[PDB]
Structure formats: structure tokens, C-alpha cells
Structure 1
Amino acid sequence: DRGVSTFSPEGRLFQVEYSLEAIKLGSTAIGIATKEGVVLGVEKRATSPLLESDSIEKIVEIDRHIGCAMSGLTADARSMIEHARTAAVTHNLYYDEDINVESLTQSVCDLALRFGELMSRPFGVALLIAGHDADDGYQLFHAEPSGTFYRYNAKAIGSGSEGAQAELLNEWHSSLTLKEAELLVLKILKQVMEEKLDENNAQLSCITKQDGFKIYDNEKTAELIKELKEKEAAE
């Protein structure tokens, strides 16, 4: 056939480029960083009404100061999350401190290109890694299967991403409050989702310095959806 680690004539790894196509097929995940916190939101996308939607775990805790949202082949993320959690806890053991969000992201991304003929193929999942540390404050990173990571003020990944990213382009400013960011994620999710947005097919989360990483209750998200509808009807 052809090598797994083969370069194309344009200078790209075939497998990495093909894994990026799998991520486009994934459900939408959106992150928005502010000075009051970082908000992470996801489309759940239950394949059937009999599937108990609360078991869809696409937002995940890495440490108390670092959260993570995923899009693509979500089964591939479990070993990445495991490594992240171990890296966070191991660094605390060796240094008696929280680990920097960038350092954690860099550790996850070191796994990415460990594939060949090590694992047999790249990961088919992109991660939004959101967190807080004392050095660089509130941060949002986009970790790909290329091994590259970009910091973002806001970022969307998954099937609605280019549409969502254009919307995040207009809407994001440096003075966003946490409450504003929550509504903004819900707004853009509702735009790019196929099914109508509610508390059962979408999930919110955030990371603040005081309270750490928290996945929002369905009752709490339901109130923010009702608050969104009223403020859009308001003009």
C-alpha cells in the first residue's frame, strides 16, 4: 500500500490530513476565553431518542484548574485524557504545585505524532483544553493530531466550525464577562446544530480561579437557554 508516516508531494503527512477530515465529521465543540473564566460547550448529538443523553461525556476534567472538550472520534480521546490527568498529577507530585496549562497541552501533543510501523495511526480527535494558572491566567488551547497546538481567545471545532469561527470572529472582545460568554457559546451552538438546542442535547462548562473546573447542571443550562431566547427576542 504506502507508509503510514508518508509525506505527500505538498509536504503534509497523509494520515494527519485524513484524521483532520474525521474531526470535521465530529460534533461541535466551542471554547471562549475571558478574564473572568473560560467557557467550554459541546453538542451532544444523540444518535437515537432512547440513548440517555447525560451519559454522553464530551466535556472532561483533567485537574481542578484544567478542563477539556472533544470533537471527532471521541473514543480516541480516552487515552489522551488519561495521559493528561497522569501528567497533571505527576507534576504536582514532583513539584508541589499546579501544572501550567501550556505545559499540560504540550504533554498531550507529544503523543500525537508517535505513530508508525508506538500506535498505528494518529488520533482522530481534536481537543479544546481550557484552564487557569498563576503565570499566564485564563487560557484556551486547540490541540490537534498533527502535534501542533494554538492558543485561542475563542475557538470552534467539529462539523459547524468554520461557520462558528466566523461568528466568534465578530462577537469576541477582550471585555467579555463570563455570563456573556456562556450565552455566546449557546447562541453559536444553536446556530450550527442540526437539532433544536436544549439542556439535554447540549452541555456547558467553565473553569474559574475560585471554583475550578465545573460541568454545568442541566437545570442551570436550561435557565441560560431561556435567558438567551428572551434576549434575542428583545431586539
Structure 2
Amino acid sequence: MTDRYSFSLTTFSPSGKLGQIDYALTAVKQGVTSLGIKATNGVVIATEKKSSSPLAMSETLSKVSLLTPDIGAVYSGMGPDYRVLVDKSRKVAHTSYKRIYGEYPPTKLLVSEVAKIMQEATQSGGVRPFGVSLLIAGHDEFNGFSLYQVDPSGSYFPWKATAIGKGSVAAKTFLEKRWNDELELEDAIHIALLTLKESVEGEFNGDTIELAIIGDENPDLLGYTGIPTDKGPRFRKLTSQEINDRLEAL
């Protein structure tokens, strides 16, 4: 018995390709489109809620996840792989940072820790790479707002705006025309909804779209009062109603 697979399942081919990483990226290509846009006073991340069945409750399945109060994440590719990455990402934020420094990690460093986990699945024994690409939006005091992409290889890149998955090629082109360095958060949400309508085919409403923002602090969502320095989470998930309001003036 015991795990006898102590050797790498991802290796270099004669051409220099790492096959399993390439094939993981192919799985991401098949995945549903998700995107992220950075504004001057915030960041928006969005994706389509592809329902497996109309009997299924799509509210129970959350594609956009809170990692820290000021950091959020969305993906394209294999959902189960994403779910466990979110669990590990939330934990590593505590174990390797918050329990040491008494504060949440900045976006770039949390991204770095997630990238490390994904890199190890590329080299460690008896495992395949994760079949997902992440988009991680976040805010911190000294770096401000930021948006990162993380690939199956463990590589990460900062973006002004980008898209991943099914219709990423067209969606990136759309964002190049609309993006400027003077965009306000509401303008970025508007552009996000426009970009996403192109890739979505069926119903386009608050129930089939999942969208969250990294913006101003939310004291009402904090849950308590009495500490002035604690002002609330910058991460907020837009409700089904809030999305539909913006779809009328579209």
C-alpha cells in the first residue's frame, strides 16, 4: 500500500513543453468566461453562473469567493480544483501572515502564496497541476487596488483589466477599447457587464451573473462597532437586485 507515486507526473518533453501544464491551460480554455477590471477607486470581478440543471439552486454554488475582507477571487476552468484552492488560500493567509503580523496580507503576497501552491502541483510527486486560472482582485494600504491573474504553472501577472476562459480573446479586445486610467468604479462595473454579455448566450440577469467588487470600506457589513481603525471589508458581492438595476441603464 502507501503512495508509491513519489515521482513527477509533469516532465519536460523533447521540445521543451511541460505537457500537463499545457493540457491544464486547455481545460481553462474550455471553462466559462470570467473577467476583471481595475478602476481608480476600485476593482470589479465578474463571471457567468453556468447552471448544471434548472432544478439546481445556483445561489449555493459561489464562483466568486472572499479570501480576505479586502481580497476576492474568481476563476475559469475546473470548479472543484478552484474550491479547494480557495480553502487553502484562505488558510495560508492566516497561517503564513495574519498569525505572524496581526494583519491581512497585501494582494501581491497572497497571490504569491497561491502561486506557490499551484507551482508545487506542477513539480511534486504523484499529482497533476490544478486545472484553473484565477483572477484575484484586492486592496491594501501601501499598494492600493490591484488585479492579478494566476495560471496552472504558478505564474502570475498584474493586470489593468483582463479576461480568461471561453471567450477571453474577444473579451480582452473589447476591454482594450474601453479601458482608460481615469475610469471610476461605476464605469468599470458598466464595462464589465457589457463585456460579459458578449460571451453569455442564454439568460442575462442578476440570477445568471455573479459579480463582486473591491471598493470603499463597508462599516455596515463589519458586524460590530467600537473600534475606529476597523472600518469594514472592501470586498462586497453585488446582489441579484443590484445587478438588474444597472442592466436597465445599459
Which stretch of the first structure deviates more once superposed, 114-123 or 212-221? 114-123
Match of 2:25 in 1: 20
Aligned partner of 2:119 in structure 1 is 113
Partner of 1:102: 108
Equivalence for 1:197: 204
Q: Which runs of 5+ in 1 are unaligned?
A: 229-235
Q: Which has the larger radius of gyration?
A: 2
Q: Is the 8 A contact 1:160 1:193 kept in 2?
A: no
Distance in 1, matches of 2:126 and 2:56, equals 31
What secondary structure, in the 3-state scheme, does the structure 2 residue paired with 1:204 have? Answer: strand
- 3-state SS of paired residue (1:32): strand
2:226 aligns to what? none
Contact 2:44 2:214 in 1 (8 A): yes
Deviation string 1:67-98 (CA, Å, 9 cap, x unpaired) is 00011101001221122111222312211222
Q: CA deviation at 1:119?
A: 5.5
The answer on 1:158 being equivalent to 2:165 is yes
**Structure 1-normalised TM-score?**
0.92
In the alignment, the residues of structure 2 paired with residue 155 and residue 92 of structure 1 have an alpha-carbon distance, to the nearest angstrom, of 29
With normalisation by structure 2, the TM-score equals 0.86
What RMSD over aligned residues (CA atoms) do the two structures have, in Å? 1.6
SS for the counterpart of 2:136 is: strand
Structure 1 stretch displaced more, 158-167 or 84-93: 84-93
**Aligned position for 1:225:** 247
Residue identity in the other structure for 1:67: G
Kindly tell me the number of residue pairs found equivalent between the two proteins.
Answer: 227
- The gaps in structure 2 that reach 5 residues or longer are 1-7, 219-233
Letter in structure 2 aligned against 1:208: G
- The one-letter amino acid of 1:225's match is L
User: Shift in Å at residue 221 of structure 1?
Assistant: 0.7
Alignment of structure 1 residues 73-222 onto 2, 5 Å: 73-90=78-95, 91-115=97-121, 120-211=127-218, 212-222=234-244
> 1: distance between equivalents of 2:161 and 2:124?
37
Q: Secondary structure at the match of 2:56?
A: coil
User: Quick one: percent identity of the two aligned structures?
Assistant: 33
Q: Which amino acid aligns with 1:102?
A: K
